[PDB]
GROMACS .gro file of N, CA and C in nm:
model
  363
    1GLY      N    1   0.082  -0.120   0.000
    1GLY     CA    2   0.000   0.000   0.000
    1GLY      C    3   0.087   0.126   0.000
    2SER      N    4   0.103   0.183  -0.119
    2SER     CA    5   0.183   0.303  -0.134
    2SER      C    6   0.170   0.357  -0.276
    3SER      N    7   0.163   0.489  -0.286
    3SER     CA    8   0.151   0.554  -0.416
    3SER      C    9   0.163   0.705  -0.400
    4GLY      N   10   0.175   0.773  -0.513
    4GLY     CA   11   0.188   0.918  -0.513
    4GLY      C   12   0.094   0.981  -0.616
    5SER      N   13  -0.035   0.958  -0.596
    5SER     CA   14  -0.135   1.012  -0.686
    5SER      C   15  -0.257   1.059  -0.606
    6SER      N   16  -0.322   1.162  -0.659
    6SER     CA   17  -0.440   1.217  -0.594
    6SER      C   18  -0.551   1.112  -0.589
    7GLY      N   19  -0.620   1.109  -0.476
    7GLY     CA   20  -0.728   1.014  -0.457
    7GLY      C   21  -0.845   1.078  -0.382
    8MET      N   22  -0.891   1.009  -0.279
    8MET     CA   23  -1.002   1.058  -0.199
    8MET      C   24  -1.107   1.125  -0.287
    9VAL      N   25  -1.197   1.043  -0.339
    9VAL     CA   26  -1.304   1.093  -0.424
    9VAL      C   27  -1.425   1.128  -0.338
   10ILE      N   28  -1.485   1.242  -0.370
   10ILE     CA   29  -1.602   1.288  -0.297
   10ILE      C   30  -1.728   1.259  -0.380
   11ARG      N   31  -1.801   1.158  -0.336
   11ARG     CA   32  -1.923   1.119  -0.405
   11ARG      C   33  -2.046   1.171  -0.329
   12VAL      N   34  -2.133   1.238  -0.403
   12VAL     CA   35  -2.254   1.294  -0.345
   12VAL      C   36  -2.376   1.227  -0.408
   13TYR      N   37  -2.473   1.195  -0.323
   13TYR     CA   38  -2.595   1.131  -0.369
   13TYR      C   39  -2.711   1.229  -0.370
   14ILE      N   40  -2.736   1.285  -0.488
   14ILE     CA   41  -2.844   1.381  -0.504
   14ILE      C   42  -2.961   1.314  -0.576
   15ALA      N   43  -3.069   1.389  -0.591
   15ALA     CA   44  -3.188   1.338  -0.657
   15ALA      C   45  -3.224   1.431  -0.774
   16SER      N   46  -3.140   1.428  -0.876
   16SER     CA   47  -3.162   1.511  -0.993
   16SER      C   48  -3.312   1.522  -1.022
   17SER      N   49  -3.375   1.406  -1.033
   17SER     CA   50  -3.518   1.401  -1.060
   17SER      C   51  -3.597   1.432  -0.933
   18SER      N   52  -3.566   1.547  -0.875
   18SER     CA   53  -3.633   1.590  -0.753
   18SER      C   54  -3.742   1.693  -0.787
   19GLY      N   55  -3.810   1.738  -0.682
   19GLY     CA   56  -3.916   1.836  -0.699
   19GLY      C   57  -3.896   1.955  -0.605
   20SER      N   58  -3.879   1.922  -0.477
   20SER     CA   59  -3.859   2.025  -0.376
   20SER      C   60  -3.741   2.115  -0.416
   21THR      N   61  -3.775   2.238  -0.452
   21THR     CA   62  -3.673   2.334  -0.492
   21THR      C   63  -3.558   2.335  -0.391
   22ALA      N   64  -3.595   2.349  -0.264
   22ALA     CA   65  -3.496   2.352  -0.158
   22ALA      C   66  -3.388   2.247  -0.186
   23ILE      N   67  -3.433   2.124  -0.202
   23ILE     CA   68  -3.342   2.014  -0.230
   23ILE      C   69  -3.252   2.052  -0.347
   24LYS      N   70  -3.315   2.070  -0.462
   24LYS     CA   71  -3.242   2.106  -0.583
   24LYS      C   72  -3.134   2.209  -0.548
   25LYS      N   73  -3.176   2.314  -0.479
   25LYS     CA   74  -3.085   2.419  -0.439
   25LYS      C   75  -2.975   2.359  -0.351
   26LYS      N   76  -3.017   2.308  -0.236
   26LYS     CA   77  -2.923   2.248  -0.142
   26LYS      C   78  -2.819   2.167  -0.220
   27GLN      N   79  -2.869   2.072  -0.297
   27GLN     CA   80  -2.781   1.987  -0.377
   27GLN      C   81  -2.687   2.072  -0.462
   28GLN      N   82  -2.746   2.171  -0.529
   28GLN     CA   83  -2.668   2.260  -0.613
   28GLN      C   84  -2.573   2.344  -0.529
   29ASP      N   85  -2.604   2.352  -0.400
   29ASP     CA   86  -2.523   2.429  -0.308
   29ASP      C   87  -2.398   2.348  -0.270
   30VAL      N   88  -2.417   2.217  -0.264
   30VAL     CA   89  -2.308   2.128  -0.229
   30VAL      C   90  -2.223   2.102  -0.354
   31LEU      N   91  -2.290   2.095  -0.468
   31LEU     CA   92  -2.222   2.071  -0.594
   31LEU      C   93  -2.148   2.198  -0.636
   32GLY      N   94  -2.224   2.307  -0.646
   32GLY     CA   95  -2.167   2.434  -0.686
   32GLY      C   96  -2.040   2.465  -0.606
   33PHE      N   97  -2.047   2.436  -0.477
   33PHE     CA   98  -1.934   2.460  -0.389
   33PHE      C   99  -1.812   2.379  -0.433
   34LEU      N  100  -1.834   2.249  -0.448
   34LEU     CA  101  -1.727   2.159  -0.490
   34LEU      C  102  -1.678   2.201  -0.629
   35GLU      N  103  -1.767   2.264  -0.703
   35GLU     CA  104  -1.735   2.309  -0.837
   35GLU      C  105  -1.655   2.440  -0.831
   36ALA      N  106  -1.701   2.529  -0.744
   36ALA     CA  107  -1.635   2.658  -0.728
   36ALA      C  108  -1.500   2.638  -0.660
   37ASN      N  109  -1.495   2.536  -0.575
   37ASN     CA  110  -1.373   2.505  -0.502
   37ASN      C  111  -1.285   2.413  -0.588
   38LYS      N  112  -1.334   2.384  -0.707
   38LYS     CA  113  -1.262   2.298  -0.799
   38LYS      C  114  -1.223   2.169  -0.727
   39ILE      N  115  -1.320   2.112  -0.656
   39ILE     CA  116  -1.296   1.989  -0.582
   39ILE      C  117  -1.328   1.870  -0.672
   40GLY      N  118  -1.259   1.760  -0.645
   40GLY     CA  119  -1.279   1.638  -0.722
   40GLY      C  120  -1.389   1.552  -0.661
   41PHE      N  121  -1.513   1.586  -0.695
   41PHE     CA  122  -1.627   1.512  -0.645
   41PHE      C  123  -1.701   1.441  -0.758
   42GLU      N  124  -1.802   1.364  -0.719
   42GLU     CA  125  -1.880   1.289  -0.816
   42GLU      C  126  -2.030   1.311  -0.791
   43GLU      N  127  -2.103   1.327  -0.900
   43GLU     CA  128  -2.247   1.348  -0.891
   43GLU      C  129  -2.321   1.215  -0.902
   44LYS      N  130  -2.383   1.176  -0.791
   44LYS     CA  131  -2.458   1.051  -0.787
   44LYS      C  132  -2.607   1.082  -0.770
   45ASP      N  133  -2.684   1.037  -0.868
   45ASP     CA  134  -2.828   1.059  -0.866
   45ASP      C  135  -2.896   0.941  -0.796
   46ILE      N  136  -2.992   0.974  -0.712
   46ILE     CA  137  -3.066   0.872  -0.639
   46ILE      C  138  -3.206   0.858  -0.698
   47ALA      N  139  -3.253   0.967  -0.757
   47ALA     CA  140  -3.384   0.968  -0.818
   47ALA      C  141  -3.397   0.850  -0.914
   48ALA      N  142  -3.313   0.852  -1.017
   48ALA     CA  143  -3.313   0.746  -1.116
   48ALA      C  144  -3.250   0.620  -1.056
   49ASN      N  145  -3.118   0.625  -1.043
   49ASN     CA  146  -3.045   0.512  -0.988
   49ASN      C  147  -3.098   0.481  -0.848
   50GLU      N  148  -3.148   0.360  -0.833
   50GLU     CA  149  -3.202   0.316  -0.705
   50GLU      C  150  -3.090   0.264  -0.615
   51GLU      N  151  -3.014   0.170  -0.669
   51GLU     CA  152  -2.904   0.111  -0.594
   51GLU      C  153  -2.830   0.219  -0.515
   52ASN      N  154  -2.801   0.329  -0.583
   52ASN     CA  155  -2.731   0.440  -0.520
   52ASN      C  156  -2.809   0.484  -0.396
   53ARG      N  157  -2.936   0.513  -0.417
   53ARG     CA  158  -3.022   0.556  -0.308
   53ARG      C  159  -3.031   0.448  -0.200
   54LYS      N  160  -3.068   0.328  -0.244
   54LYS     CA  161  -3.080   0.216  -0.153
   54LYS      C  162  -2.947   0.196  -0.079
   55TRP      N  163  -2.846   0.159  -0.155
   55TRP     CA  164  -2.714   0.137  -0.098
   55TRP      C  165  -2.684   0.251  -0.001
   56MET      N  166  -2.686   0.372  -0.055
   56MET     CA  167  -2.660   0.490   0.026
   56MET      C  168  -2.741   0.487   0.155
   57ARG      N  169  -2.869   0.455   0.141
   57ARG     CA  170  -2.958   0.449   0.255
   57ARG      C  171  -2.907   0.346   0.357
   58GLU      N  172  -2.858   0.235   0.304
   58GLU     CA  173  -2.805   0.129   0.388
   58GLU      C  174  -2.670   0.170   0.447
   59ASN      N  175  -2.612   0.273   0.388
   59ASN     CA  176  -2.483   0.323   0.433
   59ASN      C  177  -2.505   0.432   0.539
   60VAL      N  178  -2.591   0.527   0.504
   60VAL     CA  179  -2.622   0.637   0.594
   60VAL      C  180  -2.635   0.583   0.737
   61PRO      N  181  -2.569   0.654   0.831
   61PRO     CA  182  -2.572   0.615   0.971
   61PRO      C  183  -2.707   0.650   1.035
   62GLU      N  184  -2.744   0.571   1.134
   62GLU     CA  185  -2.870   0.592   1.204
   62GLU      C  186  -2.870   0.729   1.272
   63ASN      N  187  -2.758   0.761   1.334
   63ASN     CA  188  -2.744   0.888   1.404
   63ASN      C  189  -2.761   1.002   1.304
   64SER      N  190  -2.753   0.967   1.176
   64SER     CA  191  -2.767   1.065   1.070
   64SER      C  192  -2.904   1.050   1.003
   65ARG      N  193  -2.957   0.929   1.012
   65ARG     CA  194  -3.086   0.899   0.952
   65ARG      C  195  -3.195   0.985   1.017
   66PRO      N  196  -3.295   1.025   0.933
   66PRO     CA  197  -3.405   1.107   0.980
   66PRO      C  198  -3.503   1.024   1.063
   67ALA      N  199  -3.619   1.083   1.087
   67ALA     CA  200  -3.722   1.016   1.165
   67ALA      C  201  -3.771   0.893   1.088
   68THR      N  202  -3.800   0.914   0.960
   68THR     CA  203  -3.848   0.807   0.875
   68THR      C  204  -3.869   0.857   0.732
   69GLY      N  205  -3.822   0.777   0.637
   69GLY     CA  206  -3.835   0.812   0.497
   69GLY      C  207  -3.698   0.832   0.433
   70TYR      N  208  -3.602   0.755   0.481
   70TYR     CA  209  -3.466   0.763   0.430
   70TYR      C  210  -3.412   0.906   0.440
   71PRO      N  211  -3.277   0.917   0.430
   71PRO     CA  212  -3.212   1.047   0.438
   71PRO      C  213  -3.231   1.125   0.308
   72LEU      N  214  -3.278   1.248   0.323
   72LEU     CA  215  -3.301   1.334   0.209
   72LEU      C  216  -3.169   1.400   0.167
   73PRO      N  217  -3.160   1.432   0.035
   73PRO     CA  218  -3.040   1.495  -0.018
   73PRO      C  219  -3.032   1.642   0.022
   74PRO      N  220  -2.913   1.702  -0.002
   74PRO     CA  221  -2.803   1.629  -0.061
   74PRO      C  222  -2.739   1.534   0.040
   75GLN      N  223  -2.656   1.444  -0.011
   75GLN     CA  224  -2.588   1.348   0.073
   75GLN      C  225  -2.442   1.332   0.029
   76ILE      N  226  -2.352   1.379   0.114
   76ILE     CA  227  -2.210   1.371   0.085
   76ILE      C  228  -2.157   1.234   0.131
   77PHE      N  229  -2.072   1.176   0.047
   77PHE     CA  230  -2.014   1.047   0.077
   77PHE      C  231  -1.870   1.038   0.025
   78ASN      N  232  -1.781   0.998   0.115
   78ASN     CA  233  -1.641   0.984   0.080
   78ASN      C  234  -1.618   0.848   0.014
   79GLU      N  235  -1.619   0.848  -0.118
   79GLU     CA  236  -1.598   0.726  -0.194
   79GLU      C  237  -1.714   0.629  -0.170
   80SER      N  238  -1.732   0.592  -0.044
   80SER     CA  239  -1.838   0.501  -0.007
   80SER      C  240  -1.892   0.537   0.131
   81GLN      N  241  -1.801   0.573   0.220
   81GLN     CA  242  -1.838   0.611   0.355
   81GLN      C  243  -1.921   0.739   0.354
   82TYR      N  244  -1.992   0.761   0.464
   82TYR     CA  245  -2.076   0.880   0.476
   82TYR      C  246  -2.004   0.989   0.556
   83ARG      N  247  -2.031   1.113   0.517
   83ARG     CA  248  -1.970   1.227   0.584
   83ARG      C  249  -2.077   1.311   0.653
   84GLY      N  250  -2.174   1.354   0.575
   84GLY     CA  251  -2.283   1.435   0.628
   84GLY      C  252  -2.370   1.490   0.515
   85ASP      N  253  -2.473   1.563   0.554
   85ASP     CA  254  -2.564   1.622   0.458
   85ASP      C  255  -2.543   1.773   0.452
   86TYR      N  256  -2.616   1.837   0.363
   86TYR     CA  257  -2.606   1.982   0.347
   86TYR      C  258  -2.587   2.050   0.483
   87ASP      N  259  -2.653   1.995   0.583
   87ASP     CA  260  -2.645   2.050   0.717
   87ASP      C  261  -2.500   2.039   0.767
   88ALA      N  262  -2.449   1.917   0.764
   88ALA     CA  263  -2.312   1.892   0.808
   88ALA      C  264  -2.215   1.967   0.716
   89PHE      N  265  -2.258   1.985   0.592
   89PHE     CA  266  -2.176   2.054   0.494
   89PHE      C  267  -2.161   2.202   0.530
   90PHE      N  268  -2.275   2.266   0.552
   90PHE     CA  269  -2.276   2.407   0.587
   90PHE      C  270  -2.199   2.432   0.717
   91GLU      N  271  -2.230   2.350   0.816
   91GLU     CA  272  -2.165   2.362   0.946
   91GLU      C  273  -2.013   2.355   0.930
   92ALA      N  274  -1.969   2.252   0.859
   92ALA     CA  275  -1.826   2.233   0.836
   92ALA      C  276  -1.771   2.353   0.759
   93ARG      N  277  -1.860   2.418   0.685
   93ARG     CA  278  -1.821   2.534   0.607
   93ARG      C  279  -1.796   2.654   0.698
   94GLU      N  280  -1.898   2.686   0.777
   94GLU     CA  281  -1.889   2.798   0.868
   94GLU      C  282  -1.765   2.784   0.957
   95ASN      N  283  -1.735   2.659   0.992
   95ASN     CA  284  -1.620   2.631   1.076
   95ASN      C  285  -1.495   2.621   0.989
   96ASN      N  286  -1.512   2.656   0.862
   96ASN     CA  287  -1.401   2.653   0.768
   96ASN      C  288  -1.325   2.521   0.785
   97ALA      N  289  -1.400   2.413   0.789
   97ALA     CA  290  -1.341   2.281   0.804
   97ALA      C  291  -1.413   2.182   0.713
   98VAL      N  292  -1.461   2.234   0.600
   98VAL     CA  293  -1.531   2.151   0.504
   98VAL      C  294  -1.439   2.040   0.455
   99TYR      N  295  -1.323   2.081   0.404
   99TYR     CA  296  -1.226   1.986   0.354
   99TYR      C  297  -1.206   1.870   0.452
  100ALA      N  298  -1.204   1.905   0.580
  100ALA     CA  299  -1.187   1.805   0.684
  100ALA      C  300  -1.311   1.716   0.690
  101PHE      N  301  -1.426   1.778   0.668
  101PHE     CA  302  -1.552   1.706   0.671
  101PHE      C  303  -1.568   1.620   0.546
  102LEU      N  304  -1.479   1.641   0.451
  102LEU     CA  305  -1.482   1.566   0.327
  102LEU      C  306  -1.360   1.475   0.319
  103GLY      N  307  -1.281   1.479   0.425
  103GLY     CA  308  -1.160   1.397   0.432
  103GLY      C  309  -1.056   1.444   0.330
  104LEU      N  310  -1.075   1.567   0.284
  104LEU     CA  311  -0.984   1.625   0.187
  104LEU      C  312  -0.874   1.702   0.260
  105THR      N  313  -0.790   1.768   0.182
  105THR     CA  314  -0.681   1.846   0.238
  105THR      C  315  -0.703   1.995   0.213
  106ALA      N  316  -0.652   2.075   0.306
  106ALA     CA  317  -0.665   2.220   0.295
  106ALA      C  318  -0.535   2.278   0.242
  107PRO      N  319  -0.549   2.390   0.166
  107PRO     CA  320  -0.433   2.457   0.108
  107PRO      C  321  -0.356   2.535   0.215
  108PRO      N  322  -0.222   2.541   0.196
  108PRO     CA  323  -0.136   2.612   0.290
  108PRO      C  324  -0.149   2.763   0.272
  109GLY      N  325  -0.212   2.826   0.370
  109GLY     CA  326  -0.231   2.970   0.366
  109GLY      C  327  -0.379   3.006   0.381
  110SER      N  328  -0.464   2.910   0.346
  110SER     CA  329  -0.607   2.930   0.355
  110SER      C  330  -0.650   2.937   0.502
  111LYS      N  331  -0.777   2.968   0.522
  111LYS     CA  332  -0.832   2.978   0.656
  111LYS      C  333  -0.842   2.838   0.717
  112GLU      N  334  -0.844   2.739   0.629
  112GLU     CA  335  -0.853   2.600   0.673
  112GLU      C  336  -0.720   2.555   0.733
  113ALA      N  337  -0.614   2.620   0.689
  113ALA     CA  338  -0.481   2.588   0.738
  113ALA      C  339  -0.442   2.685   0.850
  114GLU      N  340  -0.482   2.810   0.831
  114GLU     CA  341  -0.453   2.913   0.929
  114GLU      C  342  -0.514   2.877   1.065
  115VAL      N  343  -0.646   2.868   1.066
  115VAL     CA  344  -0.718   2.834   1.187
  115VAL      C  345  -0.655   2.908   1.305
  116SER      N  346  -0.705   3.028   1.329
  116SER     CA  347  -0.655   3.110   1.438
  116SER      C  348  -0.762   3.211   1.481
  117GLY      N  349  -0.820   3.185   1.597
  117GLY     CA  350  -0.923   3.273   1.650
  117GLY      C  351  -0.994   3.208   1.770
  118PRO      N  352  -1.049   3.296   1.858
  118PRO     CA  353  -1.119   3.248   1.976
  118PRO      C  354  -1.257   3.194   1.940
  119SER      N  355  -1.316   3.122   2.034
  119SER     CA  356  -1.448   3.064   2.012
  119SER      C  357  -1.449   2.982   1.883
  120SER      N  358  -1.438   2.851   1.900
  120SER     CA  359  -1.437   2.762   1.785
  120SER      C  360  -1.489   2.624   1.827
  121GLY      N  361  -1.589   2.577   1.754
  121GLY     CA  362  -1.647   2.447   1.782
  121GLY      C  363  -1.539   2.344   1.816
   0.00000   0.00000   0.00000
């Protein structure tokens, strides 16, 4: 086990074929971000592809699972493991620790690397 190539793929399970604008937005909020941040993520649709949704559902942690009706998108997933939803995404964002919440790396000089200030989760 050893190599020198970029990895850690960020797979997100969205529902392209969704209806609730909020969702669409949220999803687009998680995607747009990874896009604006030029992050190496993957767009996984749950609407069409069931396995993705199902599998994902079987992956999603209970502590993360809602009351009932499977976890709603967006849904961030590290390759296969689960990270969090738009909620966990935003939170990790405000805390400028998204990359960490995605198991990614932060750039040297950014606020993610700087991390210097009082009152911090």
